Amino acid sequence: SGPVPSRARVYTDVNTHRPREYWDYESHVVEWGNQDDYQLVRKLGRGKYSEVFEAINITNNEKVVVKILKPVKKKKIKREIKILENLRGGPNIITLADIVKDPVSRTPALVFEHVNNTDFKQLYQTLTDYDIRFYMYEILKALDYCHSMGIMHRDVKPHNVMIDHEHRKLRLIDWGLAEFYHPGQEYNVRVASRYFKGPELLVDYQMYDYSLDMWSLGCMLASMIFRKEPFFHGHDNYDQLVRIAKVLGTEDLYDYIDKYNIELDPRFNDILGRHSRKRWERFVHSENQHLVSPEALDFLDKLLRYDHQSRLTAREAMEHPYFYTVVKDQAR
Numbered sequence: 001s002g003p004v005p006s007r008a009r010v011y012t013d014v015n016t017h018r019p020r021e022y023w024d025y026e027s028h029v030v031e032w033g034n035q036d037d038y039q040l041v042r043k044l045g046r047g048k049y050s051e052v053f054e055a056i057n058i059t060n061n062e063k064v065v066v067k068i069l070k071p072v073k074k075k076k077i078k079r080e081i082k083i084l085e086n087l088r089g090g091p092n093i094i095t096l097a098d099i100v101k102d103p104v105s106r107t108p109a110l111v112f113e114h115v116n117n118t119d120f121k122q123l124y125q126t127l128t129d130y131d132i133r134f135y136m137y138e139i140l141k142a143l144d145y146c147h148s149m150g151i152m153h154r155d156v157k158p159h160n161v162m163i164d165h166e167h168r169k170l171r172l173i174d175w176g177l178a179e180f181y182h183p184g185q186e187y188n189v190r191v192a193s194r195y196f197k198g199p200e201l202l203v204d205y206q207m208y209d210y211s212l213d214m215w216s217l218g219c220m221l222a223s224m225i226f227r228k229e230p231f232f233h234g235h236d237n238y239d240q241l242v243r244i245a246k247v248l249g250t251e252d253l254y255d256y257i258d259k260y261n262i263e264l265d266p267r268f269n270d271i272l273g274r275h276s277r278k279r280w281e282r283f284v285h286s287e288n289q290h291l292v293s294p295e296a297l298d299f300l301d302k303l304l305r306y307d308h309q310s311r312l313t314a315r316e317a318m319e320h321p322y323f324y325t326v327v328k329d330q331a332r
């Protein structure tokens, strides 16, 4: 017998109840703007499949960000565009403003609202305890929204969280790996960056769901409260699961594998070994203790579970005591 099937615990059937066109991105027709509306100002960075520029919309003098795509399959471009349009206006989701066809690369360029980001390798060292709770809450708003809209991001990590700290403004970016959740669908496990890959990806369990994003969120939270980046520091995808197991223990890993009848790549047998589940205090020291509290550790523990079905949902996460002060302040 093969692996046991799985279904999302929440938002299971939201796409089924939508018109086909909502999620059937292969049939999406792209609406193009005018490439001449935009003049590039300077290069801001790069993606795996893109180069990113600051630009000016010369018809209204608005600053925008332009993501010029490298060669990608057209259906993957349609997928990113369709997801961005479906999610437009949702809390802390980057706003796709336009789509143009670049004359030089002959490739598409996605035009986004401008965000004045502070690089997290500089920002995260300055955040307070309250700042971490605040920005985690804002990320959760974006994730609960996209999950409720039938979409999993699949690439949650600090590089994909833009923060204008001066204005306490956050946007979740780079929807190029995001996918629609359909119950029973088996997904590509070659997604997300190594340090943020969930155990389901590392053991090749394909019937995963929104809860993948919650593992990644827990990896980010751990790196921020312990000031250890990355938290799970694997040398490759196999060693990545070893690093997780040295913290979460091997017992719950093998229980997870047994529960879903997952056939474990034989290369894992010689490297996983046997490891106890460690206490989070092992990562607390004088340089990070001001960011670590009983509430933070309780919240973290409920995100970082092997069994994707047992992780907090984004909505459950937002109701955790860790956020009580944030929730109370946002009410006034």
Ligand SMILES: C=CCOc1cccc2c1-c1c(c3c(n1C(C)C)CCCC3=O)C2=O
Pocket (backbone or CB within 6 Å): 044, 045, 046, 047, 048, 050, 052, 065, 067, 094, 112, 113, 114, 115, 116, 117, 118, 159, 162, 173, 174, 175
């Ligand atoms: C300091 C620069 C601010 O950066 C912005 C601002 C607004 C919108 C986006 C970005 C952006 C996007 C994407 C990428 N950046 C950056 C990290 C270089 C990297 C590759 C993937 C990607 O999509 C935006 O969508």
Ligand SMILES: [Cl-]
Pocket (backbone or CB within 6 Å): 031, 085, 096, 097, 098, 099
């Ligand atoms: Cl659009």
